[PDB]
Amino acid sequence: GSSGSSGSHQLIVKARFNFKQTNEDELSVCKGDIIYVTRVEEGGWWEGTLNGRTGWFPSNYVREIKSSERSGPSSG
Structure with missing residues (x-):
């Protein structure tokens, strides 16, 4: 079997430094x-929340925090 995990592939990433929005x-x-x-x-930008x-x-x-996302860019 496989039975994926349909829910949310949200990527948890922590900021780096003081980043001001343009x-x-x-x-x-x-x-x-x-x-x-x-x-x-x-492309270069990443849209998150x-x-x-x-x-x-x-x-x-x-x-990046998620260790399952690092070696797993969603799918490809």
Whole structure:
């Protein structure tokens, strides 16, 4: 069998440093703020959700917590 896990592949990533948002459209993180990646783009920006926040942000910058997401970019 296999029986996947249909629910949410949200990616938990912690901010890196004081990151100011260029616009409200984008996200904004400071420090110690786990963000939830929903989009997950390889273009360069990453769209997720922060504690009562949202928008796009640099994933490369922020750190990754999920160990099942690191070696598992969703699917491919």
